[PDB]
Symmetry: C2
Amino acid sequence: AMDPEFMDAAIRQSLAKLGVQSTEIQASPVAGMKTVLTHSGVLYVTDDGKHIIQGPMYDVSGAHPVNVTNKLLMSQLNALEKEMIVYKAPDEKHVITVFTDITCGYCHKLHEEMKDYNALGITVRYLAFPAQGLESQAEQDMKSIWCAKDKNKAFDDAMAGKGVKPASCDVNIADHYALGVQLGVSGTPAIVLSNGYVVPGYQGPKEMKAFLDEHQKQT
Amino acid sequence: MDAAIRQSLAKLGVQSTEIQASPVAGMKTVLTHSGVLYVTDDGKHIIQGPMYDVSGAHPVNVTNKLLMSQLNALEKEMIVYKAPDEKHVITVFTDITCGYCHKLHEEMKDYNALGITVRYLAFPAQGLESQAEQDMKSIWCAKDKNKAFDDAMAGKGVKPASCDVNIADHYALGVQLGVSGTPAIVLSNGYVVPGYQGPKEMKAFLDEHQKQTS
């Protein structure tokens, strides 16, 4: 703590020149490179700040390749647990975190199936991801929903077509969005597994259950 | 040997064509037909390219800068339309079935007039085994490549011709450079300008880029 971290200072300065203005810098599993969190994604930067490569980074030593960028990010993701809209399964077999958008068609499709996911042992945890960006009406509307006293009711209501009641709190949707971007989320709904794996596409409950079971076995 | 890197790649179904140094100690530049990977010496970790050097005034894609060796090595297989008073050299990936490639070729005199030399490589979007690939092979195997290319682009059909020219190598290089559609304009430092850009625009862009990277 009394020892200077002057090399990280070079990273920040190097990124500042590029317009990347705020950073979190952590170790990486690769010697002489640091993991750098930015609002625009994860960057792997050499210790001296001179070279940059966009994530993700994969660990390919095992039977299946794993995205260690996303695996690492599950610490950030899990730290946002209190800001999640959680629909817990009675007999929980899997927990997925879903980046969702109240204006996205398959997010409606997915939510309509919540009972069936839950019945199959799948707990669904929601974070907000306005696919149209942070200055869209959806960001504003989702913030109200996430600031409601009953988040589950507000979210249910909105997806049924009832309409959000205004509300404010300290929850920043921009933080959910940055996490989504760092995890490689572009299209919603984006289903993220407990090890960071982002499921390609939408899958209904029966398909998702089999996928989750097999994913657990293999990884 | 790079056994560890090759072992990991083999496990993922990936065939490297080259493995060479990178700017990062302990990590190699690995060329494959699908693109460039950065892989640790121990074969444990992979990040897809490209890598940028950001130490200068402007970010430089060093992956593509490196590939300019591979690219310039293909000199003799390029169809070059030289400007009389050469100010810039650009390499262009083209397809004889691509509308914008035809627009570009029709305007070659204009690019040349502004001091821009154009060097073509083949990039048949339809991939290998396609009719476009074969026809373009025939063109690149002509005794007179410029004549054959002008003739085809003017709509005069394609004359059968055989030689050792491997279009797939052009295609692989384009893919490694980040080319996905044609025409693709590549600068002397590997920078890709995606799509078509006009002679006056290109000249101004080329002049500014030279000032930026000198």
